[PDB]
């Protein structure tokens, strides 16, 4: 696995700019803030509902531990 022996490709053109010709910080809060809100919305219904059920079991488990030692 060396660089000129990897795969076969035809009819593809790429254009690039030098790092000394561009800004290292482009649009940061103009593009970046609405981008990290799209990514948060796209994954919130998959990750979060398991950790809500851990919270409800934890509260029921510490409260029914203290309503056993009381009288």
């Amino acid at each position: 696995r060396e660089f000129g022996h990897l795969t076969r490709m035809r009819h593809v053109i790429t254009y690039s700019l030098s790092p000394f010709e561009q800004r290292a910080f482009p649009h940061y809060f103009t593009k970046g803030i609405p981008n990290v809100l799209r990514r948060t919305r796209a994954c919130i219904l998959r990750v979060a509902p398991p950790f809500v059920v851990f919270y409800l079991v934890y509260t029921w488990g510490t409260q029914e531990f203290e309503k056993s030692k009381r009288k």
């Binding site: 076969r8 490709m9 035809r10 009819h11 593809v12 053109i13 790429t14 254009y15 690039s16 700019l17 030098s18 000394f20 010709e21």
Partner: protein, 49 residues
Amino acid sequence: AGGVEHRQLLDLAQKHFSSLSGTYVEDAVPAFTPCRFTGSEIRHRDDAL
């Protein structure tokens, strides 16, 4: 260049080229916009060559 006399070429230039327009209609200076250099690259990938 070659077997030419300069006096002969000058009189042939006055006979055939003198009706060229010297100064022009409104004759504005031909503007020269310079051009800048940009460090960059372009890659065209074609493995069949």
